[PDB]
A and B are shown apart, each in its own frame.
Chain A
Amino acid sequence: QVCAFSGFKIPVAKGRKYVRLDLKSFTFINKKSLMQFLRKTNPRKVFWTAIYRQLNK
């Protein structure tokens, strides 16, 4: 599995899944990412995310 916000590869038996009412399910690596997801923060503007580092360079 891969984290929905950070894009980090999720280690086994580590993380929490979140299911929305629109049949969309996400899995996160820690509470740090999950709270960022719920605040509608873009991973493209978060410097440490794998999403950001893949876009730039």
Chain B
Amino acid sequence: GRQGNKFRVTCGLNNASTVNCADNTGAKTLTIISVKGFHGRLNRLPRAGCGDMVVATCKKGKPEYRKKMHTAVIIRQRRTWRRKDGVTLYFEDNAAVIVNMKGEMKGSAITGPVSKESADLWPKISSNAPTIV
């Protein structure tokens, strides 16, 4: 359920990287396990950037979300990445929102700014985003 392509966004989120959950679905933090579309290499850890759909497990949250594996989208990251128009940009924290394969967000609201790359790729996130930075 992903629309269009994405430019190069340097991936600052690894395997076992912990991110916040900006949704309101009782899940606090998710730790990245794998990244959808990742092309494997020897000894390389999976990498995720803004707008990258990941597979993550919830280690902190309500019982219906903890100790389970969900699917998320990185909406902001602390890694500095460069836009194609010579704009260097980075956020304050790494966060994600739970989506399914078809792309519809599980939650109903997002707290904090949402990067443009995650907003363009997923139309459902941009509809519920406060601001698109």
A and B touch in the complex (CB under 8 A): yes
| B-side interface residues, number (CB < 8 Å) | 16
- Residues of A at the B interface (CB closer than 8 Å) are 12-13, 15-21, 23, 25
Residue of B nearest to A25 (CB): B133
Q: How far is B111's CA from A21's CA once the two chains are assembled, in angstroms?
A: 8
Which 5 pairs of residues, A with B, have the shortest CB-CB distance?
A13-B86, A17-B89, A16-B88, A21-B112, A19-B91
Residues of B within 8 A of A16 (CB): 80, 88-90
Given contacts A13-B86, A25-B113, contact A19 B92 (CB under 8 A): yes
Contacts of B131 in A (CB 8 A): 23
In whole angstroms, what is the CA distance A21 to B93 when docked? Answer: 8
Cα distance A55–B52 in the bound complex, in angstroms: 46
**A19: B residues at CB distance < 8 A:** 76, 89-92, 113, 133
